Amino acid sequence: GSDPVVIVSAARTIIGSFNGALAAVPVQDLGSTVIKEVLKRATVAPEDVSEVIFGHVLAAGCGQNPVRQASVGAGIPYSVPAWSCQMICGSGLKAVCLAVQSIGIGDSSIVVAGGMENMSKAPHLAYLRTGVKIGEMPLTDSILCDGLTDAFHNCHMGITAENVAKKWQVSREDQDKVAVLSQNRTENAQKAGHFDKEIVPVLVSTRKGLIEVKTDEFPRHGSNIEAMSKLKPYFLTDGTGTVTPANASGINDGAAAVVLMKKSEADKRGLTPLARIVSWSQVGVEPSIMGIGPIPAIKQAVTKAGWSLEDVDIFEINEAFAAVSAAIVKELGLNPEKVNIEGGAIALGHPLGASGCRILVTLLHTLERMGRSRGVAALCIGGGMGIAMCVQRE
Amino acid sequence: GSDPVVIVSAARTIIGSFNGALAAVPVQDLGSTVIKEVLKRATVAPEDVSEVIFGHVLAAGCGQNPVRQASVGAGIPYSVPAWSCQMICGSGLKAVCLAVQSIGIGDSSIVVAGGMENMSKAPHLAYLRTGVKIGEMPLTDSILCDGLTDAFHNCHMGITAENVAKKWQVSREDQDKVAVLSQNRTENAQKAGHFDKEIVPVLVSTRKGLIEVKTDEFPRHGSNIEAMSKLKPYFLTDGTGTVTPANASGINDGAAAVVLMKKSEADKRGLTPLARIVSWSQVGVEPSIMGIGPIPAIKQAVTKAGWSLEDVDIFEINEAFAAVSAAIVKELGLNPEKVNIEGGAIALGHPLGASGCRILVTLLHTLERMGRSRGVAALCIGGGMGIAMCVQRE
Amino acid sequence: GSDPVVIVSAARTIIGSFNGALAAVPVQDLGSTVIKEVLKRATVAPEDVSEVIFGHVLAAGCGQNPVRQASVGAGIPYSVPAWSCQMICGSGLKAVCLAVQSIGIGDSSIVVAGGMENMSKAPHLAYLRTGVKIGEMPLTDSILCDGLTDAFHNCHMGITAENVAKKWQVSREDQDKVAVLSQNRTENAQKAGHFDKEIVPVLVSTRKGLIEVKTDEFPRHGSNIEAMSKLKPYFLTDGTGTVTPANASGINDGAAAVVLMKKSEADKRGLTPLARIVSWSQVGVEPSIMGIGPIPAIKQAVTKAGWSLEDVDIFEINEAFAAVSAAIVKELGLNPEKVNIEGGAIALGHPLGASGCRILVTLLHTLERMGRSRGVAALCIGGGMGIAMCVQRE
């Protein structure tokens, strides 16, 4: 307001498949890759960064404060504080919102915010300190334990998606249609080169030598409803299920970042931003239907912006599950041709801590490419939250 | 400033010994205990909380977003967002600073901030997804991997303490003197009932039934230099070492929380706060000497407050290691009778994510009890950071 | 027959409680202790041993061929072959029977046979070579998996004991009476010094220095039916159960050995044996009632010896469970004052691979002490086998 926070640069790694192209890359190196790149793009020297704030969910085995490792590994000096936030799938967007606060209140001048996740490298967990006299002990999967199981109902996120499918009357067929659309949109965007600008290559050391990875790995080209219709429901297997691996997001690896500063600071520095941040919201809802978090979050953020829903040109609403995506669109009455137009996480994947920033990166570049003005990024969050941000092209 | 953020209530659990009195209590239940209690103390209804922000470091195996579990378990409704921050040992104080920002900028009205850690429940970690054809695989200790090993130099925090002992010329004898002083101060504070007000009991289900735990477990009463002088250095064993288990903080379990709002909101509600928050700082330093983080952090925060160091009545500077505590005091020229006067983490323990809020809780209650005005809380942070806050009794 | 196999010396370690006095002693060192000792007792030089044959059940993590480690560690030269047999609880007696065959057929002149088990050191097991994409994996307890669970019915040995209790009509009260009797007999034998001769001390390296362990650890002195009557059934918990920890054998650590040669060789060497081996048997029965294996085994061995059951002066029948012990006695019509007169495994413990030789050692020394002539040793075996041996004092 008058001197709003603006986003000057925005980049992401490709999103790797589970146990795929980025699996050997430590999360902090994904982070360093995007941090160094957005600073390069913005022509901001690393010593001028006030702080680094990253979302990161599955941090077991990553060492002490992996965000600080990422910062230093990007060339940011030890003098610059760096820290993480966790708000499950909202984390990478929450990082951006935190930067908005720190800049807006006058504590920070330039913030690199983002998110990062290497789910392939998430470990299994054993509790060994008591010592089991006699009997089996579990090696628990941290992805399931800490990432994907609701704490209140002890059910997978996909069961919450089934809850939303039932309550919002999103059929199996509806879900597969949304999934095929997401796949086809991503394939089209890829062929057209729409992600070239946002992607920064990742260097991977291989037996055959160092290679660059610069194409998203998760999309299933030639996706079709006939093939999707044949799959069995994965999460709910009692004959009433609807969610399958083809209409759900994946488990994936990736990172994304943005450079933020006040408009006045961008002006001082001769930088034209991608967009100004208009508003943001965080909300709470019931855990059993966490997927609908974006409904109140978007409504609140749009209201705070002084907008109507019709004023929004482009939405990125994270595609946790087709059932959930469809419910949000249906309830809000959104035009599908304005929502996830480059495809979403069904096709692209969902590295938990990264996605909230990844979708913002894609949004900003879509607004830019299409010469549209107003955008919204929003995500649901396990345990019953939502987060949303309104941006306007500058 | 004019309408500053104020702290209305401040409470903590006891600090449990490693594999001790709180070992069976999930971290989120420690969190719920303090959250519910500070709201009770402040006479603030849980539905009036804007958000909950907690520090938490070792989150493996704790389930989806343990801070949200803690919030809901305290009686805060699902409508209230709850999330975590990680900045290693600074996390619990960072949570408070984040609340200052959210309130100060106008996003939140009332925040419950704090920190929590159950180190006893930290798991061991195994990477199982590739699958080892042939050979040994480690079960890595998450406390060592993620909590206590510097990422840049692959050394324990205690080696960084040895680095500081050498550079700031803090002898073995100096360190044991500081440690005995800390022990004796805590024992005196305990006997005098100085922690009664701040402590909230924890309920623990036992075979013999439910019991309340309301005394700190870690202090070693009757500590003396003769006994401490006999121990061997633990971290550096080549004959030049100085840090032992008796002059280092412990591995421990606990939680702490505070209720924050604007002065105007406290006034509206007829609440007299414990203190107003004057300033805070976060800084970066070299990882090899991370222990000295508080030197620049305190200097910056005190300067921001418009104070001189002599104006500060009481300091809580987390006692990660006696070597580090002594170095900070020596460099800054502080009066030991103004620093950690109820004892510190050598005696009381150091649950990573909780300590930054725990020391603030103890500080506020010391200012209150002694009728003193100005306080500073500060911590070092692994990877080379410092964080500090200035408060003034209201 | 004419030139029978004879046993010249017989010794055992104490039996350690689970995670108790012998828990830090590798199984092969228990073996070495008894092997070296029976050779000393027999005045047979280690280079004169033909081969070493030991029972051993739970060999995971013990290294390559632990019996060879035990042999060499006892001072037997590398020129002497050493190997193991596994027949679950029968293993230590089977080793002796194998020695009878090798000597009797003329392949070996002098054999050290025995059994050994360190159950405390049995590891947990994880299958890691495929690599689990996503999901929990068990750390399986090798004692349960490989030692104590029937392969055919996937039930604990204690469920087979319940099967026998039901079919042979051995009540809870009957079982506790047998258990108290076993405890009291062992306590009496201990007080009277009856085990002094057979026991060889084990050296254990301790922080406080090296100590000798020379008392059995498992007995519960002052055992009584009032206390036993209060315990709940452990294995079968649906209200029809009868087997509890107080009327079942333990999980334990120990080793035992014997030196065998032909009578003519003992005569040549001027050695008076403890006894001659008269006969032995191995049999199969239904796995669900494996505990009754000794009924056919004893009958067959006694028949092979040309004896009647009344001719047998002393029986050692391993006390896997009181239910099983009682069933054998009842079916065969044995005099309880001739069966397990020094107590049995309820009081003394049951290191799987050792027990078959341990009971033989105790039998031989009881015959000797009491100046009685004919003895039988017998055990049940998981999966439905029995093994028995008839001996006669020489």
Added chain:
Amino acid sequence: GSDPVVIVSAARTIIGSFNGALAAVPVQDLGSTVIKEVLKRATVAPEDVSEVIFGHVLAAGCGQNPVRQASVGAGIPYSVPAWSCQMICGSGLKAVCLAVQSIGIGDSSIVVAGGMENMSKAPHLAYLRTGVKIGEMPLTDSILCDGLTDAFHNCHMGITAENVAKKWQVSREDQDKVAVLSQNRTENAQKAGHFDKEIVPVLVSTRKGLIEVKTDEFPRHGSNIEAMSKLKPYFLTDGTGTVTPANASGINDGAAAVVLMKKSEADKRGLTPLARIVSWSQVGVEPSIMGIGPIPAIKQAVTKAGWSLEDVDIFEINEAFAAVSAAIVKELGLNPEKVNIEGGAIALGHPLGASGCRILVTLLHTLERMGRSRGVAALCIGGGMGIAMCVQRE
């Protein structure tokens, strides 16, 4: 002698590659496959078996007495005892020798002996009962710990092979020549159908349905010295090494069995045996050079038979390593055209507990096919043993 023990039938599974074609088949099912088949081949009813004796080394996680599981799973009644022997790589031949003793002394009439191993299914091991306060714990590979590491020198079997290569002056080039010869011989034998008779197919349940596996998986067709010459030494990496994966046996899965009875019993039953057993030996040597065990074992067995080495038509000497094979041949002065003429374990693989019987099976069928008379089977054994058997075609 006069009424010798004879072998009536002899069969084996294919040998599967590590984590290959048999990896999903429990070891006991491999055992059942061969046991049922040799009884079928011999036209001996399962109820007429006296006992079953199998070699088996890596038994962790296989359940209670896997040999009894194999026996029952083959259709042998519960009345028939079944048990295992362990003498590392000698185990499967030791089982046969034990059967010779039991039959020869008159205890058993018909024995099914053999060996079995599923190395793919060998677990990793963790010691969890004490409980590690703080620090890493290993998941130890049972194959390395229990199978392949010498207990006396803490070195791999391949280091013992390097010891033998040095002492017996077997160069890298010598070793690769032996390895190529083994590969080529096996490839020739395969093409010619020489293993068709001995192999019994294994049924494997697959997603695509049940399939039969009937070809050995490990051979490397088209093996050549140019390719082998390029590989680096695997075990000894200081520049003096010679043993590589191409001149060493593999880690593998398989089982083998034989049916034994007296000649008089075969005559009674109208069965023509494959061969009579003439003699056998077991010996001990130094662990550092365990590979040379067969030298004294073969010499002793041949002497016991009343033979000269020139009288032996065909040798199977297990190819643990080319270095070791070559040393034995060189020292004994054997004709290579009489040794391992169908190839050996370099090409075929080495399932530890199975190999001692597997080579006997192959030997018997080679004698039969070629119409030759006298054979020797021999193996080295970790920890410094050797075992050998002389057979003569009947």
